[PDB]
Amino acid sequence: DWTASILDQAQRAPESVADFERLLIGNPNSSVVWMNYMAFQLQLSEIEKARELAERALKTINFREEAEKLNIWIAMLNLENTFGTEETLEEVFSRACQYMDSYTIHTKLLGIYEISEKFDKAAELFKATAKKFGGEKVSIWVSWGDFLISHNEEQEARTILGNALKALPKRNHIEVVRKFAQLEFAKGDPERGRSLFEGLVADAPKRIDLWNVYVDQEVKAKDKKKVEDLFERIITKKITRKQAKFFFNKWLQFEESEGDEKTIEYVKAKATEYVAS
């Protein structure tokens, strides 16, 4: 099952050495066999042998199987994090960035630190990863904001969103703010998400997809009066007839999930007389 989690982070059963070496005869490119073989050795606390197996996998798996290679590198990161030392993990990490996509490897160690609840080490790696890649990747900011909101550091999250804006190209500013806003609804302060969305539609009033994401968040949170205020703001905006049907349909359909047939008629009435205009 140790390999089930490696496969997760990457996005007649064999019971002996001879069994695995026999499996590896016909399946040299299978990272799953190699990881199971590593887990077998790890369950017997045979750490050096597990490490040697990973080295073999790196040389034995066909060089074009980058996905199988990634699994091994993640398996080594996990192995070193759990059974090795700071220095032993650092070497594997630096080596893995050499051979695979460095940002991806950075992302995987972050996920590993979180899983093993080395929160302090996650926070330091976030800072370093955002310094190296933050000018290019919005995901590092979102993931770092996620971390901070999950550890009840709202104000630090605002600071990080500020630094994300200074570092990212202007063309990504709406996206990073939009994902911090969704993060606040999901894990943090919805009032803070509301404020972020307000600023987005304040600056890009014609970005009608933003009005949509915004009302999806308000619906998912189920404050029906804020959902209704938002729906009625939206239809007094620069939208096409095609889009107007969509928002009225979504409005109606939400009220059908609220059991208020007085307002569900209100929408039909007001929807149909919108088409009038």
Residue numbers in the entry: 1408 to 1418, 1456 to 1721
The publication says:
Among the many trans‐acting factors that are strictly required for ribosome synthesis in yeast, Rrp5 is essential for the maturation of the two ribosomal subunits and, as such, has been found associated with early preribosomal particles 6. Rrp5 is a large multidomain protein that contains 12 repeats of the S1 RNA‐binding domain at its N terminus and 7 TetratricoPeptide Repeat (TPR) motifs at its C terminus. In vivo, the N terminus is required for A3 cleavage, while the C terminus is necessary for A0‐A2 cleavages. Usually, S1 domains are prone to nucleic acid binding, while TPR domains are seen as protein–protein interaction modules.
We determined the crystal structure of Rrp5 TPR domain using a construct from residues 1400 to 1729. The purified protein was crystallized, and X‐ray diffraction data were collected up to 2.35 Å resolution. The structure was solved by a SAD phasing experiment on a Se‐Met‐substituted protein crystal. It comprises 276 residues of 329 from the construct and spans from residue 1408 to 1418, forming a short α‐helix, connected by an unresolved linker to the region 1456–1721. Overall, the structure is composed of 14 antiparallel α‐helices forming a seven TPR‐repeat domain plus the additional α‐helix located at the concave surface of the TPR domain and interacting with TPR 1, 2 and 3. Several patches of conserved residues were identified and located at the N terminus and C terminus of the TPR domain on the concave and the convex faces. At the N terminus, residues N1471 to S1475 and the loop between R1508 to E1512 form a conserved and continuous surface on the concave face of the TPR rod (indicated as patch 1 on Fig. 2A). The interaction between the Rrp5 and the Utp22 protein would involve the conserved residues identified on the convex face. Besides protein–protein interaction, cryo‐EM‐based model also suggests that the pre‐rRNA helix 24 binds to the Rrp5 TPR module using the above‐mentioned conserved residues on the Rrp5 TPR rod 24. However, this site is partially blocked by a short helix in our crystal structure. The peptide had to be removed from the cryo‐EM‐fitted atomic model 12, 17. This suggests that Rrp5 has to adapt its overall conformation concomitantly with its binding to the pre‐40S particle, as for example with Rio2 binding to RNA 27.
